[PDB]
Amino acid sequence: SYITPYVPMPCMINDTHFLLRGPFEASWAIKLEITDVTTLVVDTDNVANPTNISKCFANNQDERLLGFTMEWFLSGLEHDHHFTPQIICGNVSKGEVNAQVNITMEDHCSQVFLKMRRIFGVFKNPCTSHGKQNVLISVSNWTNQCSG
């Protein structure tokens, strides 16, 4: 049973904003935001899937460590043939988020919520809404947003 070293430090800000500080006290954190606002639309070459979501971080510094950390975050999810949310990569050079994960479908939403509750603890279930819903994934600077 393999124990990855690339485990981030979780930091829940509130029901919609979450941070995963990079392993080994990195100066960055992966930012997750639950929102019903859609910022990315599918074009001919920005679509990804859970297995290669790492490619949505190719233009980032520390790309390898970012991939290992996203691999940790999606454990149990990318292994699931039925976890098939639409994922779109954003243009980070134009200020867009790294990835937009479509969680409008209830089964996908709830699978993500259950994983996030396991990592962060209890928060408001976002899946009881109807209408479009997303998780936006980006990279923020770590400024000690959580401490003891």
Ligand X SMILES: *[C@@H]1O[C@H](CO)[C@@H](O)[C@H](O)[C@H]1NC(C)=O
By CB under 6 A, residue 3 contacts ligand X = no
Q: Among all residues, whose Cβ is closest to ligand X? A: 55
As measured in angstroms, the least distance from the Cβ of 138 to ligand X is 13
Taking the least distance from each CB to ligand X, the nearer of 60 and 86 is 86
Q: Which residues contact 3 (CB under 8 A, 6 or more apart)?
A: none
Half-sphere exposure of 136 (CA within 13 A, CB side): 21
Joined together, the tokens standing for residue 139 give 């990279």
- Stretch touching ligand X by CB under 6 A, among 18-26, 41-49, 59-67, 118-126: 41-49
As measured in angstroms, the least distance from the Cβ of 4 to ligand X is 22
- Stretch touching ligand X by CB under 6 A, among 22-30, 35-43, 71-79, 115-123: 35-43
Binding site for ligand X (CB under 6 A): 13-14, 16-17, 38, 41-42, 47-49, 52, 55, 86, 89, 102, 104-105, 132
